[PDB]
Design a protein around this ligand. Structure first.
Ligand code: 7HE
Length: 153
């Protein structure tokens, strides 16, 4: 469980992400795809992209980056009370898209990397730790739903 203090650190840097949702989403998905190429292959929408420059030039990739961070922002602002936000996400990612929890760990690492890059003054180690705990909490609750549905990772 995160403390109120931890949630404030998390939401303080997230309100900054929201000044440029699309540029953060681009950076995060490109980081994820470059560092873990198995993740790109899960997207029929994006698997034609072969270079970083092509990824940066894709307007559809930018569009989906906003979809992803908008969903994640709505989750974080619930401060743990996110059961209704996670249900449909867990269901689709386990059963339709087939995304292992490990790949949620990968995108969590890409988020932290990009938040550190763009917001160092509001993403010191205390805020890094808090954001890690919030993304861990996300993964834990999704993982419980995956397990229910018989999917792994
Ligand atoms: C490695 C792949 C992977 C990973 C790590 C995620 N997803 Fe998902 N995603 C999400 C929304 C709202 C939608 C319509 C999809 C659609 C998707 C779709 C459908 C894309 C489409 O073809 O339109 C795919 C394949 C999918 N997502 C692969 C995907 C949100 C998330 C969130 C909040 C996370 C974690 C922070 C996430 N995805 C990680």
């Amino acid at each position: 469980v995160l403390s109120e203090g931890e949630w404030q650190l998390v939401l303080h840097v997230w309100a900054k992400v929201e000044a440029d949702v699309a540029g953060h989403g681009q950076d995060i998905l490109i980081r994820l795809f470059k560092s873990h190429p198995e993740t790109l292959e899960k997207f029929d929408r994006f698997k034609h992209l072969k270079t970083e420059a092509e990824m940066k030039a894709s307007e559809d990739l930018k569009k989906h980056g906003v979809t992803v961070l908008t969903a994640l922002g709505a989750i974080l602002k619930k401060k743990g009370h996110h059961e209704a936000e996670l249900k449909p996400l867990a269901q689709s990612h386990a059963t339709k898209h087939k995304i292992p929890i490990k790949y949620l760990e990968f995108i969590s690492e890409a988020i932290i990397h990009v938040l550190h890059s763009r917001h160092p003054g509001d993403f010191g180690a205390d805020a890094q730790g808090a954001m890690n705990k919030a993304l861990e909490l996300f993964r834990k609750d999704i993982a419980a739903k995956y397990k229910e549905l018989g999917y792994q990772g």
